[PDB]
Design a binder for this molecule. Structure first.
Ligand SMILES: CCCCCCCCO[C@@H]1O[C@H](CO)[C@@H](O)[C@H](O)[C@H]1O
Ligand SMILES: CCCCCCCCO[C@@H]1O[C@H](CO)[C@@H](O)[C@H](O)[C@H]1O
Ligand SMILES: O[C@]1(c2ccc(Cl)cc2)c2ccccc2C2=NCCN21
Ligand code: NA
Ligand code: NA
Length: 504
């Protein structure tokens, strides 16, 4: 079995997985909308009661499975729980990262695409008033994706958008086809420092921004001034547990697969703790210091609330580019911003395709070359649904990327800590540990952690599921049809895997 070469590479690959577009866009907007500095109260709590416990569990499950030659959840769930229904539930840990990969690599390609257009100067140059600057960039983005100009839910990506998508797939395959240590690990050691340098340079330049409408301090102010009155709102605590769960990328099946390349007795308690921390530092220090302070510096604290309400996507793909076109050296600034996001995306997409590659390798005994190429093929082909059908992206992100991961997160806890056995699980987590998990966490993992996840799931099921089902366009059935098929197809592969094993 392949293994991580160095402890540092392992930590950087894992941190690379967690640190994504969300760190620099989603988190700052969530924080501004949910109590500013006060949001750190339920955020740290969520990190301690949900994020850290579950992450350790996923590392343990991954390492446990890897020792027996299995890096994915159909095989691993079966090992923790010998039942046919365990295998079926395990398919989700293969299906979720696959579906997310199907739209996420495309989004990732947008940033590479924007980075190049900025570098070579193929971007709008307004002219005045805020809308006079924002609109040409709104239009730039819309022409790239091919946002529908009519009533048809049809997208028309530019040739440039399409070729960059091809290039992006090529880069992913390039890394993945070289394997865990010589490919993913080697790349983490380059991308993670590069990421840090870009962010630090941006944080510095943002902190020097001064306009007639405000400064970076005004931005940092608005973001971090606490609003403790929002702590009463249940949705703020849900937001925190939600934010933590998603920032760490728990429930995607990715962490388990990566951990399966950790050796049987190699530490996971400290390594895991360090990786989660890197994500957090990247999130609150760097992520919170770039996008919101820059936006508020240019548009003024008066529009801060409006900016936060406009969302993470608009901030990163419309608002900030517009600001860069109005600032000195903003052309090279825009390149750095989108290059930064691209590496943030790239370190995450490789991790998210690895479970499929691992499954093809571990269970169907494919060579790495074939496993990577076929995985790329399924992802490349399927992505045409995301590129051409409007709102397809949102549908996949809801079922797989939102509802799915929380359900799968809860499923992992129960199978490992309740079915497999809390005591067997506890020893599994601490074995080889440079540090030992604090004894209090034995109760957290068994009762508190699943309780939190259950509450989150129910609130979200009650809140969002009725809306998506009753108020959406008929074309959503196209996306549902396709991803349900993917689940059927994966089930078949799991079926073929167990049959091959019975023969040999
Ligand atoms: C943290 C960054 C997350 C990236 C969010 C990507 C969501 C963009 O998604 C797309 O945006 C287009 C522009 O409005 C819309 O026309 C499409 O309906 C939508 O699918
Ligand atoms: C059924 C699979 C067909 C997938 C078609 C993908 C290629 C079509 O591509 C289309 O044509 C233009 C150039 O070709 C580009 O502007 C865009 O990529 C796209 O709109
Ligand atoms: O960027 C992701 C991610 C997860 C899986 C893949 Cl295949 C690609 C990207 C992501 C997407 C959507 C919601 C949450 C998350 C996430 N958490 C860490 C990495 N990561
Ligand atoms: Na993150
Ligand atoms: Na990443």
């Amino acid at each position: 079995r392949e293994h991580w070469a160095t402890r540092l590479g392992l930590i950087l690959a894992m941190a690379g997985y967690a640190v994504d577009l969300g760190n620099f866009l989603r988190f700052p907007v969530q924080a501004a909308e949910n109590g500013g500095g006060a949001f750190m109260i339920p955020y740290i709590i969520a990190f301690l009661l949900v994020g850290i416990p579950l992450m350790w569990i996923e590392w343990a499950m991954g390492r446990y499975g890897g020792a027996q030659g299995h890096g994915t959840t159909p095989a691993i769930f079966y090992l923790l729980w010998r039942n046919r229904f365990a295998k079926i539930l395990g398919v989700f840990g293969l299906w979720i990262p696959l579906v997310v990969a199907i739209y996420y690599v495309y989004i990732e390609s947008w940033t590479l695409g924007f980075a190049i257009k900025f570098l070579v100067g193929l971007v709008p140059e307004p002219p005045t008033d805020p809308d006079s600057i924002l609109r040409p960039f709104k239009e730039f983005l819309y022409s790239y994706i091919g946002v529908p100009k009519g009533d048809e839910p049809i997208l028309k990506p530019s040739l440039f958008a399409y070729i960059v998508f091809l290039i992006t797939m090529f880069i992913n395959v390039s890394i993945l086809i070289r394997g865990i240590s010589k490919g993913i690990e080697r790349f983490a050691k380059i991308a993670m420092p590069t990421l840090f340098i870009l962010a630090v340079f941006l944080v510095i330049r943002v902190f020097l921004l001064e306009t007639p409408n405000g400064t970076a301090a005004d931005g940092l102010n608005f973001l971090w001034t606490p609003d403790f009155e929002k702590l009463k709102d249940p949705g703020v605590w849900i937001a925190a547990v939600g934010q933590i769960f998603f920032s760490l990328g728990l429930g995607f099946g990715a962490i388990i697969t990566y951990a399966s390349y950790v050796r049987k007795d190699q530490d996971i308690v400290l390594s895991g703790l360090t990786a989660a921390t890197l994500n957090e530092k990247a999130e609150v220090i760097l992520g919170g210091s770039i996008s919101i302070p820059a936006a508020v510096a240019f548009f003024g604290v008066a529009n801060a609330v409006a900016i936060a309400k406009a969302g993470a996507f608009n901030l990163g793909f419309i608002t900030l580019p517009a600001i860069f076109s109005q600032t000195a050296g903003g052309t090279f600034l825009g390149f750095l911003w989108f290059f930064l996001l691209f590496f943030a995306g790239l370190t995450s997409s490789i991790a998210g395709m690895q479970p499929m590659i691992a499954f093809l390798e571990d269970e169907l005994k494919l060579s790495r070359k074939h496993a990577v190429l076929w995985t790329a093929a399924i992802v490349f082909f399927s992505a045409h649904l995301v590129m051409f059908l409007n709102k397809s992206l949102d549908e996949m992100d809801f079922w797989a990327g939102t509802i799915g991961v929380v359900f799968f997160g809860l499923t992992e806890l129960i199978i490992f800590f309740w079915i497999f056995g809390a005591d067997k699980a506890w020893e599994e987590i601490n074995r080889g540990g440079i540090i030992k998990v604090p004894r209090i966490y034995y109760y957290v993992m068994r009762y508190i952690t699943p309780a939190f996840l259950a509450v989150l799931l129910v609130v979200w099921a009650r809140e969002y599921i009725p809306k998506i089902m009753e108020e959406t366009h008929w074309t959503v059935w196209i996306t549902r049809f396709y991803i349900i098929g993917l689940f059927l197809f994966l089930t078949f592969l799991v079926f073929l895997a167990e049959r091959r094993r019975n023969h040999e």
